[PDB]
């Protein structure tokens, strides 16, 4: 099926998912000089204090840390959002080298990686129905730059060995996602889509201005994961990011000046 290789990469996705050439595709380049400062944008409210992580899984294109979303345990609200959005999972996109890896770019600048915390609008009952609505999802995007180590990320880094190949999973409880947030919650927001097939256009993107730094050693661990399943030729999981898409008729708003 789809992937990030020469023969099944982002350029080929449109054949199986025509929406790839849609009107509100992600990611996009964030031009800081044309972004519109919107003073009506309220601050973000991140309530992750009762978060309950369950397991981590290598799905062939990234690794997913899944959470229990049967109750308002870890929620996002405020900002450009109407209603409460529940955290269901998070994953990253990274590169083969420190100079690439993020999906969104800021004034064309690429970061080493990008964290996506996926949430769904509780008004819709479950994730499956949320993806049928234009305001069904809210994804918090956080940039990662190489520098000092992020203590709160080591727990994830350490378990990667047990889920090296596609299909493997491991129990991953008591992980606190608050350890992955930057100091400031200033952000840019725009209407977009999931960046991997089915590329559904139900996402309200909230990209934080301030990146978090991780050590070279931490990011190196990501690059040791495999795309392939066990007993198959080794294909390192690197460059699992989609290039910027045309903004078309959309305006990116900023919560800061």
Question: How many Å apart are CA 180 and CA 145, to the nearest integer?
Answer: 13
| 93 annotated among ligand-binding-site residues | yes
Distance in Å, CB of 199 to Zn ion, minimum = 11
First to last CA, the chain: 43
Tell the smallest beta-carbon distance from residue 17 to Hg ion (Å): 13
To the nearest whole angstrom, how small is the minimum distance from the Cβ of residue 113 to Zn ion? 10
Given Zn ion, Hg ion, none, residue 202, with its beta carbon under 5 to 8 Å by kind, binds: Hg ion
CB-based contact 122:72 (threshold 8 Å) = yes
Does 61 participate in catalysis according to the annotation?
yes
What is the spatial distance between Cα 35 and Cα 250, in angstroms, rounded to a whole number?
Answer: 10
Nearest CA among 247, 193, 218, 188 for reference residue 101 = 218
How open is the CA angle 176-187-95, to the nearest 5 degrees? 65
Can the peptide bond before residue 228 be classed as cis, meaning omega within 30 degrees of 0?
A: no
Out of 1, 14, 33, 61, the active site residue is 61
Phi, psi of 215 (to 5 degrees): -80, 160
Residues of span 188-217 touching Zn ion by CB under 5 A: 195
Whole-Å CA distances, 229 to 123, 171, 238: 37, 19, 15
The answer to whether 72 and 215 are in contact (CB under 8 A) is: no
**Which single residue brings its beta carbon nearest to Zn ion?**
116
116 is in an annotated binding site: yes
> Which CB, 79 or 192, lies closer to Zn ion?
192
- Sole binder of Zn ion in the list 24, 61, 116, 242 (CB under 5 A): 116
- Binds Hg ion by CB under 5 A, chosen from 65, 202, 203, 254: 202
Stretch that binds Zn ion, among 21-29, 73-81, 167-175, 187-195 (CB under 5 A): 187-195
At closest approach, how far in Å is the CB of 200 from Hg ion? 5
Report whether 14 belongs to an annotated binding site: no
Binding residue ranges: 91, 93, 116, 195-196
Active site residues per annotation: 61
Binding residue ranges for Zn(2+): 91, 93, 116
Residues that bind Hg ion (CB under 5 A): 200, 202
């Amino acid at each position: 099926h789809w992937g990030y290789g020469k023969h099944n990469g982002p350029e080929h996705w449109h054949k199986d998912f025509p929406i790839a050439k849609g009107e509100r595709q992600s990611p996009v380049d964030i031009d800081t000089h044309t972004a519109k400062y919107d003073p009506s944008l309220k601050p973000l409210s991140v309530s992750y204090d009762q978060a309950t992580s369950l397991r981590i899984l290598n799905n062939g294109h990234a690794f997913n840390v899944e959470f229990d979303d049967s109750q308002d345990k870890a929620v996002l609200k405020g900002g450009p959002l109407d209603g409460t959005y529940r955290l269901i999972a998070f994953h990253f996109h990274w590169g083969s080298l420190d100079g690439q890896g993020s999906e969104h770019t800021v004034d064309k600048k690429k970061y080493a990686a990008e964290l996506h915390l996926v949430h769904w609008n509780t008004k819709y009952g479950d994730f499956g129905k949320a993806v049928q609505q234009p305001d069904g999802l809210a994804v918090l995007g956080i940039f990662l730059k190489v520098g000092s180590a992020k203590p709160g990320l080591q727990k994830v880094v350490d378990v990667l060995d047990s889920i090296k190949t596609k299909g493997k999973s491991a129990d991953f409880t008591n992980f606190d996602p608050r350890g992955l947030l930057p100091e400031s919650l200033d952000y840019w927001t725009y209407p977009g889509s999931l960046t991997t097939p089915p590329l559904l256009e139900c996402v309200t993107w909230i990209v934080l201005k301030e990146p978090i730094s991780v050590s070279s050693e931490q990011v190196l661990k990501f690059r040791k994961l495999n795309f392939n399943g066990e007993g198959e030729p080794e294909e390192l999981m690197v460059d699992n990011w989609r290039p910027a898409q045309p903004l078309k008729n959309r305006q990116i708003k900023a919560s800061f000046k």
